[PDB]
Design a protein around this ligand. Structure first.
Ligand SMILES: O=c1ccn([C@H]2C[C@H](O)[C@@H](COP(=O)(O)NP(=O)(O)OP(=O)(O)O)O2)c(=O)[nH]1
Ligand SMILES: O=c1ccn([C@H]2C[C@H](O)[C@@H](COP(=O)(O)NP(=O)(O)OP(=O)(O)O)O2)c(=O)[nH]1
Ligand SMILES: O=c1ccn([C@H]2C[C@H](O)[C@@H](COP(=O)(O)NP(=O)(O)OP(=O)(O)O)O2)c(=O)[nH]1
Ligand SMILES: [Mg+2]
Ligand SMILES: [Mg+2]
Ligand SMILES: [Mg+2]
Lengths: 114, 114, 114
């Protein structure tokens, strides 16, 4: 790191999302509420796109919720995964794929930038 | 079934989502955590698109959470709805519209497919 | 009000979302489950677009969950924010930015509109 999103990989050619792994081992319990998991991946995103961070279905089904996150086109910070253990104690091992980044078109509008 | 996504219907012409129903009667309690509800609808999706499964607002407000799900362009499995009773006991009757499929453009990138 | 979405503002030029504030002071507890917060902003959306309502990351991290909401292209009602206190008591002050509206392309399909 810092590593750009061009280093992320897709599971398969037809996968919508780019996979995201935590760089740490983390244990989460329901009483902890939302935690921001480090990925060591950084924006910004390709021109005219923004990002959505979503959970992987297999991880959601194992009781780890990823709250959808919006990554702005010009965000240059670290992409973090906002996560919560739903019901039980969840253990995230270093390098496990926990979420996915989806890229979507950024529509321009005349909304004021105030 | 198997039924393709072309069999899904929109509530109205201007509806973003295609409605999804469970093919079973299911009761959900908060302690159960995430459950994958059968729809009997199968991918794949139209060329150059991927799917997002989201909750219907009326169903969310009645205490059933649908976790956002990504449906890859070339997924040929059954589209399932990942769902949780938030606070109370929720009963899903066979044929009730529980979620919606939204289609979005699949942006191509040079990310490796490893 | 009624106020149209053209009155919403972006945090910065590169922000994907248009910010949404509640027009009321609201306290939320976990046992309350989902609440629909008033914004005094109304659809409809620009041609060929639909909307997604998502949480702001800073608000999610402070324990207020926004359930993703789909806003249809031709929705002319009030845009409400579906929200839940995750673990703790959350207080929403009048005018605090609580969610964001993202605009996305509405793909046309031949799905029946029944
Ligand atoms: O899961 C997420 C969500 C957002 N982020 C980063 C990227 C995004 O561009 C940035 C700001 O996100 P939001 O607009 O959702 N957050 P907020 O409204 O609290 O911050 P700001 O006022 O800077 O826009 O936070 C993540 O790293 N992970
Ligand atoms: O709500 C959902 C989410 C995903 N799915 C299916 C369709 C999608 O293409 C497939 C894989 O989804 P994810 O990439 O989110 N899951 P995961 O990363 O666990 O599986 P894989 O390693 O196969 O990519 O699972 C559903 O049926 N419902
Ligand atoms: O967060 C949200 C979600 C939806 N809505 C409004 C806008 C949208 O067009 C409308 C209908 O949303 P859904 O299709 O998700 N709800 P549902 O399927 O329950 O209603 P309908 O049968 O009218 O389509 O509700 C909001 O105001 N906030
Ligand atoms: Mg995957
Ligand atoms: Mg609907
Ligand atoms: Mg913001």
């Amino acid at each position: 790191q810092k590593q750009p999103i061009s280093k992320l990989t897709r599971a398969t050619p037809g996968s919508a999302g780019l996979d995201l792994c935590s760089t740490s081992h983390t244990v989460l319990t329901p009483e902890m509420g939302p935690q921001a998991l480090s990925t060591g991946i950084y924006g910004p995103l390709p021109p005219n796109t923004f990002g959505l961070i979503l959970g992987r279905s297999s991880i959601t089904m194992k009781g780890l919720q990823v709250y959808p996150g919006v990554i702005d086109n010009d965000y240059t910070g670290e992409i973090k995964i906002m996560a919560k253990a739903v019901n039980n104690i969840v253990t995230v091992s270093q390098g496990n794929r926990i979420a996915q980044l989806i890229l979507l078109p950024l529509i321009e509008t005349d909304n004021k930038v105030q």
